[PDB]
């Protein structure tokens, strides 16, 4: 028999992103109650939520309207600036010597071990967000999992991905014989949903002032919380979550499908208190899209501010500026598209042009990274809003446009 | 090999429209007996028939004088207010995220799959009825089928349309090469016939108090019910139904005629109990001439005439019947007066109300203008939903003539003004 290991990562920071760290803390509680040991649970969370000045209940983090704390006892392996690509990949590979900091807890796994990786945050076509620069490109993650497989240091690896466009991290990249089973919250071109907001569906107390969960995440976690996990397979959870959140986003699976025949117990253990709660088979809580969760906040601030006050004038100005910036980024991309391809634009059609199923986002990932840097050098940093344009940039690469031509068109539109 | 999928939709509601939901439930029974799975059969029915207070046999729906129930086991994917354009189009496209409600069952089809779409209700020039507004405009449906084709998520798609003027949904709009074969009950300018009314040739027992089938529908369905469907092609069913009901309406076909070479089995499966009933190649059943709008009235007349004299039931049924008829008169007078105001003479008004564009031409060039004209008329003159949507021909002619919404609005306001 082997050891059950886990890697839990929130790829974001800021109180607005409370939900991603809340999701991670909840995933830890499940694994802990299931009998998975702390020494085998690697936690990556920026850790700026529990004691943020906006937190109504400092020292606590909730992930449901039940207001149950999930923060207590959560290991702090990689926090702050240690939540970075380098540490995440070295952790997966089990290389303690490649770390920039942190506890040094890694996936120093053996061939009969089981691995459960859970990522939660912002996602973009072929890119997962990080609270630190740089972002996680899909090819680096897949290369890492291929290297992990080559080492032969596990029997089964399960990867759950909570992010917009998360199918694009695995689609046309992940080979099927690595003993890796992947479940993603949304497909290419799709945004994932937040759950448990003060003003949306099940009532979360207004004082939290942010959404405390992510729809795909709370769905699989609330399910994992209430059953004897020996009685529910990974496949049955996939189907359960997929069907339950189908109205919001499309749960997709990748890799080695026979791995999903394993019970959830094989990866998450099981809570003895749920032994009699057997799974038999084989109420919308979804709030808003992740990419509009911050915008909903600027709106709420503006709406709640008193008429005629300086607070209303300021919140209005801030909200208008956030929206004008989205218009500026959209116009810059459209102007670049017109320059590279002709005045008949297509910026929106290219962006609404997603490759056929089973095809990777881009053929040349170095070209994609280069196109991002090239846009960012002449124009502003893409950051949260504009990172969705990795699709347009991937299309430029696939079309054969060179960095010099992107640099030329970018300098011309962005002065 | 692929999976056989189906979308069954009754575009109406109300006990007077019992027949369209009966038609759908019967189509489901055929598909079920043919081996087509429930998970692949999307049903849209308002579902206000089985337990309507006027139903003599609650929990049952019949589609023939044989009184055989067709309601049992019919999936309830989209019922009530979920029978709407948005859900119908998202279902076709296989988009679960674009639904307003319902089961979430969609045409989440693969490239080798077969699709059978069956629509039954009221039809109008370039518009199919929905249980409430907005109605289904032909351009949106055709755009949806073009988008579906672009996705490449099917091998063959068969669309049967039971409705008046149903050829106008595809005429001048549906291209070839989409692997879509269409069969329609009636051509432009033609009303479709109903079947099995309490006073039609083979009559339904009187207690049903309404017509229980539609002629084109019961013809293809009764045929699909009795044969080994491997031995009858879509083309043979087309010729069979067309010839059998030629006295009533013109069955028309659109799209990719080589698709119709496929056996009915490829879309509807086949009932093992009919294996020995091989299709080959007494023609005396001629139903009485009852058109869609005449059928709706049969019900209002029935609950009036059967009600006891002096009873609150008779007074209520009388009032509703008089109001239904006065409303038809109001819509007819308004459109005619509007036509006279815009075009200057009874002759030109009549021309604009009645002209059918040549065959192969779309009803209207500007579908947004048509939608606008409908909304403009409705704003000043009241809903065309209950009755009057047959006047989309007149509205399409207004559009094609270059009349603007402001001129339609002034004429409608002037005509439908009726206060001190
Ligand atoms: Na009307």
Short mmCIF file of N, CA, C and O and ligand atoms in Angstrom, two decimals, chain B residues 327 331 383-388, ligand 1:
data_model
loop_
_atom_site.label_atom_id
_atom_site.label_comp_id
_atom_site.label_asym_id
_atom_site.label_seq_id
_atom_site.Cartn_x
_atom_site.Cartn_y
_atom_site.Cartn_z
N UNK B 327 -62.56 39.41 -30.85
CA UNK B 327 -61.15 39.72 -30.93
C UNK B 327 -60.61 39.44 -32.34
O UNK B 327 -59.85 40.25 -32.84
N UNK B 331 -58.93 42.25 -34.78
CA UNK B 331 -57.64 42.09 -35.47
C UNK B 331 -57.84 42.24 -36.98
O UNK B 331 -57.07 42.97 -37.61
N UNK B 383 -51.96 42.26 -28.60
CA UNK B 383 -51.28 41.03 -28.97
C UNK B 383 -51.90 40.34 -30.17
O UNK B 383 -53.11 40.32 -30.31
N UNK B 384 -51.05 39.82 -31.07
CA UNK B 384 -51.44 38.99 -32.22
C UNK B 384 -51.27 37.52 -31.83
O UNK B 384 -51.54 36.64 -32.62
N UNK B 385 -50.79 37.26 -30.61
CA UNK B 385 -50.49 35.94 -30.06
C UNK B 385 -51.66 34.96 -30.13
O UNK B 385 -51.55 33.94 -30.79
N UNK B 386 -52.78 35.30 -29.49
CA UNK B 386 -54.02 34.51 -29.45
C UNK B 386 -54.54 34.27 -30.89
O UNK B 386 -54.97 33.16 -31.23
N UNK B 387 -54.47 35.31 -31.74
CA UNK B 387 -54.93 35.30 -33.13
C UNK B 387 -54.38 36.50 -33.91
O UNK B 387 -54.37 37.63 -33.40
N UNK B 388 -54.09 36.27 -35.17
CA UNK B 388 -53.68 37.36 -36.06
C UNK B 388 -52.27 37.31 -36.60
O UNK B 388 -51.90 38.12 -37.44
NA1 LIG C 1 -54.11 38.24 -31.15
#
